[PDB]
């Protein structure tokens, strides 16, 4: 018998969209959205890669930066260490690690300074829904 050993690397498709309405029904297509600060924000993250049965979309950390650059030193974390932020009451999460979609809502804001644009950047970590317990329960 002859064994040839070959391999490869693949990527999974995870998406993020702005919801035009609460309860996360319709997505947003426009290139720049113009709201008031008092208004809230409806966002969700989709998972389109595969094996949604064995995997659960789970949010580890997310933040806001004034620029498209994600590594901006000025970061307003919206989720800290798998936890919705406690010091700000207007932050709420609906599902995290529960299913293949992660969503959350928060009041809109503006970065203090000569900054007129806000960008949102999150980082996801998939998990095994049987091998490890993916429910994040956070308390101060």
């Amino acid at each position: 018998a002859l064994n040839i050993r070959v391999g490869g690397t693949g990527m999974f498709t995870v998406r993020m969209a702005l919801f035009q309405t609460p309860s996360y029904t319709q997505p947003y297509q426009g290139s720049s959205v113009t709201l008031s600060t008092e208004a809230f924000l409806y966002v969700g993250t989709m998972l389109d890669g595969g094996d949604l049965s064995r995997f659960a979309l789970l949010m580890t950390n997310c933040y806001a930066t004034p620029s498209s650059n994600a590594t901006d030193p000025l970061k307003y974390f919206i989720i800290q260490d798998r936890c919705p932020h406690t010091r700000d009451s207007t932050i709420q999460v609906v599902e995290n690690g529960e299913s293949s979609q992660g969503r959350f809502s928060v009041q809109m804001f503006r970065f203090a300074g000569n900054y007129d644009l806000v960008y949102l950047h999150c980082e996801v970590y998939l998990c095994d829904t049987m091998n490890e317990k993916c429910k994040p329960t956070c308390s101060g």
Binding site: S31, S32, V33, L35, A70, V118, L120, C122
Partner: peptide, 8 residues
């Protein structure tokens, strides 16, 4: 992952 839509 991040939005592709600008916010103002």
């Amino acid at each position: 992952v991040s939005l592709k839509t600008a916010l103002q």
